[PDB]
Structure 1
Amino acid sequence: ATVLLEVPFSARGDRIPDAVAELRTREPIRKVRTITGAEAWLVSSYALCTQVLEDRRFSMKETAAAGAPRLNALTVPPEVVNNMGNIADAGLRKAVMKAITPKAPGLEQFLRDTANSLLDNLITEGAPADLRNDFADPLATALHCKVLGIPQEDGPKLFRSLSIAFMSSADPIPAAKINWDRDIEYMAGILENPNITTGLMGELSRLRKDPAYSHVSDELFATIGVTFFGAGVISTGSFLTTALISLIQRPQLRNLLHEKPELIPAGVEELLRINLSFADGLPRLATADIQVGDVLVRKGELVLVLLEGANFDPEHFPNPGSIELDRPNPTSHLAFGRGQHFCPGSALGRRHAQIGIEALLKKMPGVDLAVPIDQLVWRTRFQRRIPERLPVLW
């Protein structure tokens, strides 16, 4: 006898396990056990992943209900799981989205200048360099301080909460509450700080004093700062890191992009498609009995949408493991989700990766791993897949 198949299958972000294509072909929705001991339905084909993400009866908000089957323990208060819904209910969706676009004057030049300064510091120090801790994560942190309007020097202490805040744990995490409460106090101070007049926190601080928002709560204003810093920094730093691995392991493509940087946006869209940064399927709770493939999912059951199941589906992306810059459907991957909860930071995340890669290819055209790939240490029990260090030479 064996126990029911457990998820996740592997914390490695440099290879997709053979189980995924096997499930997708044989059982594109099938029952699994999560780290809490709950059962769930794992969806692994592009068709069924899009069906679930486009049907709001598979609810994000209801995953926070007491008693529900859980993917992992909450690391924020339950009402924060409905963060974007709360932002939309407060009439703040358009304002938040405007503040986090990469189109703000000078923002791209600030990202380029920051990437070039970090790279020059590594070149001065000499190989090996760690492109996660001393390049992709400080570039994500500096970008998000600039986008929020908060001091660059406050980035590193907010960042250090993230290796706990974005854990994927079977049990509640006492340090996540200590850091959450501290980071909320900091964002509440930022709203009262007269020096903060730009970016998303300067805009929320002005709307807070406008009569059209006088009953929006101070807890929501501070929550938007902590959640958008943390989601944006963990997601862009982790995606850039694992995209640099995929590029370093494809020297022919790396040389193509170095030679013709105008192809970097199409290369980044393929590195999104093949990215294994999300460590778990996206969770949803059924609010009705709904047929998905050969399974009748029942109200109250947990469904997990495996993004790499969709993104490596050869029925939708033929030769799925290959980066091909001339696909006819290049932005139809699920790396930013789909439907009601599609990522609000998608443009910013694409621009962070494009500028980081352009800068790295110009400054370190011979970049390569400095250790054998199997020596990278993959973080476990985390909502992203990331190597703890990414040692390179050039």
Structure 2
Amino acid sequence: ATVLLEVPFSARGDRIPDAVAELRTREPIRKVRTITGAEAWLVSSYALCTQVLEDRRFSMKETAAAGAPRLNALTVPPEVVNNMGNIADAGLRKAVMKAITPKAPGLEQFLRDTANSLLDNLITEGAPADLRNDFADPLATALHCKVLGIPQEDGPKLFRSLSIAFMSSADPIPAAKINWDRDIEYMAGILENPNITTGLMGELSRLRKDPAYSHVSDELFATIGVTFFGAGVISTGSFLTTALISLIQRPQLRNLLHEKPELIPAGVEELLRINLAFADGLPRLATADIQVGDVLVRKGELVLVLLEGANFDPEHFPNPGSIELDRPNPTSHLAFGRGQHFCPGSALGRRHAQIGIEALLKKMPGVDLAVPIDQLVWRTRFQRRIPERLPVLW
């Protein structure tokens, strides 16, 4: 008597469990138990992961349904799970997506200036430095304040919500609601603030008073701010942190990218491909009986799309664990998802990582871990895998 295989497998973000490949080979769709006690189907091949993400009958929205089998507890109101649908329904999708590209004048220069300041401060203070708490996350937080059009000084408090907001918990989290409600009131005030005229919130603030959006709720406008700040900051800060580990562990690659920084975009795409920051499969609920591989998934069942399942699939990415800058299919990974809910911040995510890495390699060409890799403390029961601190020297 063993128990049903539990997910997630490991909170360690520096290496993929040997188990994933064994599972992909033996049973690329298989039954697992989540932290709530619910059963789910874990999908781990590139082929099946793509099938599920490209079939909307595997629904994101319906994961929020009362009584559904759950990966984890909601940390937002249930309607907010369909945030992107809600945005599209309100006629705001084009405007939202336009505000969060890396293309606004001054944005990239702001990113570089900010990275360089953070780095200069670390160099002035002397090794060891914490690249997560004192570089990657602050860079993410600064970026998103700028992208939203909100004061830099407001970023830290919003950031402080995230260690709870992105928990992956069996049970509802009282602190999540306290912080959610507070952050919503914050964004509501931002929309009322005549001095906020730039970024996403500046644009939302104008659309809010345009007749074509008079019946769009103030709740939805505030929700867009909280949701995009949170997803953006947690996703970019965590990706960059774990990408830095991948790089640091590859001195040859570090030197190549330092010597030839025009390769940094190709480097970042591979670092995205091999990234283990998403802690759990992407959840979807079946709205029909659907054949996936050898399993007939039944209506009402939960499906988890394991991104590293797809991204380390040797059928699609030969020598999957190696960073190779000359692959013929380099953006075909699932780091940003696929299909209806493909990441709307993908360009911005790329640029944050590319600029952060460029700046780091320039300032700290000798960057290395200052502790044995095993000494990193991996955050548990969270929607990302991240080291609590990332101590480096240079």
- Name the TM tier (shorter chain): over 0.9
Structure 2: distance between partners of 1:146 and 1:195: 14
Task: Look up the match of 2:178.
Answer: 178
CA distance in 1, matches of 2:284, 2:64: 10
Give the deviation of 1:353 after TM superposition: 0.1
| Cα deviations by residue, 1:308-357 (Å, 9 ceiling, x for unpaired) | 00000000000000000000000000000000000000000000000000
C-alpha separation in 1, matches of 2:334 and 2:75: 24
Q: Which runs of 4+ in 1 moved over 3 A?
A: none
CA deviation after TM superposition for structure 1 residue 15, in Å: 0.5
Tell me how far 1:362 sits from its aligned partner.
0.2
Give the aligned partner of residue 348 of structure 1: 348
Unaligned runs of 5+ in 2: none
In the alignment, the residues of structure 1 paired with residue 110 and residue 295 of structure 2 have an alpha-carbon distance, to the nearest angstrom, of: 50
In structure 2, how many angstroms separate the alpha carbons of the residues matched to 1:36 and 1:165?
Answer: 17
Superposed CA offset, 1:185-204 (max 9, x none): 00000000000000000000
User: For residues 301 and 142 of structure 2, what CA distance do their matches in structure 1 show?
Assistant: 40
How far off its partner does 1:70 sit? 0.1
Q: 2:129, 2:47 → 1: CA distance? A: 41
Aligned-residue offset at 1:125: 0.2
Distance in 2, Cα, partners of 1:162 & 1:196? 23
Partner of 2:236: 236
Separation (CA, whole Å) in 2 of partners of 1:2 and 1:105: 58
**TM superposition shift of 1:219:** 0.2
Shift of 1:47: 0.2
SS in 2 for 1:299: coil
- Paired position in structure 1 for 2:47: 47
Counterpart-to-counterpart distance in 1, 2:300 and 2:54: 18
Secondary structure (helix, strand or coil) at the match of 1:30 reads: strand
Q: Distance in 1 between matches of 2:252 and 2:125?
A: 28
Shift of 1:80: 0.1
Equivalent in the alignment of 1:76: 76
The Cα offsets for residues 198-219 of structure 1, whole Å up to 9 and x where unpaired, read as 0000000000000000000000
Q: C-alpha separation between the residues in 1 aligned to 2:215 and 2:41?
A: 40
In 1, Cα distance between equivalents of 2:194 and 2:100: 21
**Is 1:169 the equivalent of 2:169?**
yes
| Local SS of the residue matching 1:253 | helix
Q: Which residue of 2 aligns with 1:224?
A: 224
Give me the whole-angstrom Cα distance separating, in 2, the residues matched to 1:63 and 1:159: 26
Rounded Cα–Cα distance in structure 2 between residues aligned with 1:221 and 1:315: 43
How far the C-alpha of 1:163 sits from its partner, in A, is 0.1
Q: 1:90, CA displacement in angstroms?
A: 0.1
1:240-291 Cα shifts (integer Å, max 9, x gaps)? 0000000000000000000000000000000000000000000000000000
Distance in 2 separating the partners of 1:277 and 1:285: 22
Tell me how far 1:33 sits from its aligned partner.
0.1
Q: What secondary structure is seen at the aligned counterpart in 1 of 2:291? A: strand
Q: In 1, Cα distance between the equivalents of 2:113 and 2:274?
A: 28
* Alignment partners' CA distance in 2, 1:176 and 1:274: 30
Deviation at 1:11, TM superposition (A): 0.1
Please state how far the C-alpha of 1:175 moved relative to its aligned partner: 0.1
Cα distance in 1 for partners of 2:279, 2:136 equals 19
Residue 229 of structure 1 and its aligned partner are, at CA, apart by 0.2
Distance in 1 (alpha carbons) for counterparts of 2:140 and 2:262: 22
Tell me the number of residue pairs that the alignment of Structure 1 and Structure 2 aligns: 394
What's the CA shift for 1:56? Answer: 0.3
Q: What's the secondary structure of 1:389's corresponding residue?
A: coil
Distance in 2 between the 1:260 and 1:177 partners? 47
Q: Secondary structure at the match of 2:31?
A: strand
Residue 232 of structure 1 deviates from its aligned partner by 0.0
Quote the offset at 1:17 in angstroms.
0.3
Give SS of 1:340's match. helix
SS of residue matched to 2:42: strand
Q: What is the RMSD computed on CA atoms of the aligned residues?
A: 0.2
CA distance in 2, matches of 1:279, 1:97: 25
In the TM superposition, what is the alpha-carbon distance from 1:370 to its structure 2 partner? Answer: 0.1
State the 1:57 CA deviation: 0.3
How far residue 226 of structure 1 moved from its aligned partner, in angstroms, is 0.1
Deviation at 1:18, TM superposition (A): 0.8
Provide Cα deviations, 1:76-129, integer angstroms capped at 9, x if missing partner.
Answer: 000000000000000000000000000110100000000000000000000000
* Post-superposition CA distance 1:218-240 (Å, at most 9, x none): 00000000000000000000000
What displacement does 1:69 show?
0.2
Aligned to 2:199: 199
Q: 1:152, 1:241 → 2: CA distance?
A: 21
TM-score, normalised on structure 2? 1.00
Partner Cα separation in structure 2 for residue 125 and residue 310 of structure 1: 41
- Cα distance, 1:151 vs structure 2: 0.1
Quote the Cα distance in structure 1 between the aligned partners of 2:342 and 2:14: 25
- Structure 2 CA distance for aligned equivalents of residues 168 and 263 of structure 1: 35
Q: CA deviation at 1:366?
A: 0.1
Tell me how far 1:164 sits from its aligned partner: 0.1
Q: CA deviation at 1:364?
A: 0.3
SS at match of 1:303: strand
Distance 2:98 2:174 in 1: 35
Residue 215 of structure 2 aligns to a residue in which SS? Answer: coil
Inter-partner Cα distance in structure 2 for 1:89 and 1:343: 18
Structure 2: distance between partners of 1:257 and 1:296: 46
Q: 1:135 offset after TM fit, Å?
A: 0.2
